[PDB]
């Protein structure tokens, strides 16, 4: 609601609070001088003002060059405030959570990554192909053949020599 408490305008939600005001003070303040609790006229009850539950909105998109399917992530918000998958970062809608694990394609948050098979999937990252090693106290592994690989390592050295007057 958009409330006006004796000229103390604001917007948010009024809840019950265990903040036991002493009988003299009217309204409490958080850091940066914002109104957080108030006692209203005609009832004197200690209402707690909290701004309406905010949350950033992010978009997983595989690229308009490939598809128009869009996945929407409402971070740090439980799925009770409007498939739909809950994450440690927030609830991501528009993707189907799966059980198999693949390498990360689009980062999502807290070990979760996202088009595949005509749909958007959201899954726990595959940390890599698990591979135990047959250790013992007397076993040795020695290669019999090798291979020579060439890897391209790319490093910037300079930028455009800009200048502004």
């Amino acid at each position: 609601v958009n409330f006006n408490f004796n000229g103390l305008t604001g917007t948010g939600v009024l809840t019950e609070s265990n903040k036991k005001f002493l009988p003299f003070q009217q309204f409490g303040r958080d850091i940066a001088d914002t109104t957080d609790a108030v006692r209203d006229p005609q009832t004197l009850e200690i209402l707690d003002i909290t701004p309406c539950s905010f949350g950033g909105v992010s978009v997983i998109t595989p690229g308009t060059n490939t598809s128009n399917q869009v996945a929407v992530l409402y971070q740090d918000v439980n799925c009770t405030e409007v498939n739909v998958f809950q994450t440690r970062a927030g609830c991501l809608i528009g993707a189907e959570h799966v059980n198999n694990s693949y390498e990360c394609d689009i980062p999502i948050g807290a070990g979760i990554c996202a088009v595949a098979s005509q749909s958007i999937i959201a899954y726990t990252m595959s940390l890599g192909a698990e591979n135990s090693v047959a250790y013992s106290n007397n076993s040795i592994a020695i290669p019999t053949n090798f291979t020579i690989s060439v890897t391209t390592e790319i490093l910037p050295v300079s930028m455009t020599k800009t200048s502004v007057d």
């Binding site: 000229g7 940066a32 914002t34 980062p107 940390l127 591979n131 090693v133 250790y135």
Partner: protein, 318 residues
């Protein structure tokens, strides 16, 4: 911007639009350092693609590794030393100034650490080069002596003593960490200064910057626009200047963190994935090998260094 400078108000949001691409610029810089954090973590930990697993039996010729391998009885699958580190470091969120969670959760970060420990223990250094090649630990450590000009026979004829000394030193690591405050001083300093910068940024809203009130709500409620413009413009100018200062200092601090993370990755690559010859880079004294250990927003190494003891004089000739 909208939440920070203005919060729920189109009146100053319109005026903020007059300042051009400042907002997309700041948000882009913050997103860049944010993704750079995940880049740092992945580049410093995910040095091996395949997750290794320690053997079910800990028959390592006498080296009691139970202090650094993850403990199944622990609910979070963390070794005692990493648990102590997490318990040793102690860790703004209301005005649009939010915190995104790290990509690599602590569980999977610990999984990389356990994989690296298992790889080092089981295959020495070859798992960082190519395929993992299992090596019994007495021979692997005999080679690591052989890499600092100490022949194998020293190890083999002193195996029990070297194992006991290594176990005792690992235990003393726990004792030192637990009894010594600020053993995690670097991580505590970085976390504390980041949180303090955030607190100062929040506190800046308690400043008038020349306006007649530090909260734009009441000046909006009590000022006619065609003169409230100058007040709200002063307030926006000051608040945006504060945001620029915060973002710039964050950029510099993130550059320092990037340098430290690159150094950490190089150290893990050269001391963990292999034996490093460059002296005083993998711990004081001659170096053998090291163990990574996950720490909150950081990494902790255990440089296993060989150091000569009581020495005898001799009359010599070249």
């Amino acid at each position: 911007c909208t939440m920070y400078i203005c919060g729920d108000s189109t009146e100053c949001s319109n005026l903020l639009l007059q300042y051009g691409s400042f907002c997309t610029q700041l948000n882009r810089a913050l997103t860049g350092i944010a993704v750079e954090q995940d880049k740092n973590t992945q580049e410093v930990f995910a040095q091996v693609k395949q997750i290794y697993k320690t053997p079910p039996i800990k028959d390592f010729g006498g080296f009691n590794f139970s202090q650094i391998l993850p403990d199944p009885s622990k609910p979070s699958k963390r070794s005692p030393i990493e648990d102590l580190l997490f318990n040793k470091v102690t860790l703004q969120k209301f005005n649009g100034l939010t915190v995104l969670p790290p990509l690599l959760t602590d569980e999977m970060i610990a999984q990389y650490t356990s994989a690296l420990l298992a790889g080092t223990i089981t295959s020495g250094w070859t798992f960082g080069a190519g395929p993992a090649l299992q090596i019994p630990f007495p021979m692997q450590m005999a080679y690591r002596f052989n890499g600092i000009g100490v022949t194998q026979n020293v190890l083999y004829e002193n195996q029990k003593l070297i194992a006991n000394q290594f176990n005792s030193a690992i235990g003393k690591i726990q004792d030192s960490l637990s009894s010594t405050p600020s053993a995690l001083g670097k991580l505590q300093d970085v976390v504390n200064q980041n949180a303090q910068a955030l607190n100062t940024l929040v506190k800046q809203l308690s400043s008038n910057f020349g306006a007649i009130s530090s909260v734009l709500n009441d000046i909006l409620s009590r000022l006619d626009p065609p003169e409230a413009e100058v007040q709200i413009d002063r307030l926006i100018t000051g608040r945006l200047q504060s945001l620029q200062t915060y973002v710039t200092q964050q950029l510099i601090r993130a550059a320092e963190i990037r340098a430290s993370a690159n150094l950490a990755a190089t150290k893990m690559s050269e001391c963990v994935l292999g034996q490093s010859k460059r002296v005083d880079f993998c711990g004081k004294g001659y170096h053998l090998m090291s163990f990574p250990q996950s720490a909150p927003h950081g990494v902790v190494f255990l440089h296993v260094t060989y150091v000569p003891a009581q020495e005898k004089n001799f009359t010599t000739a070249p």
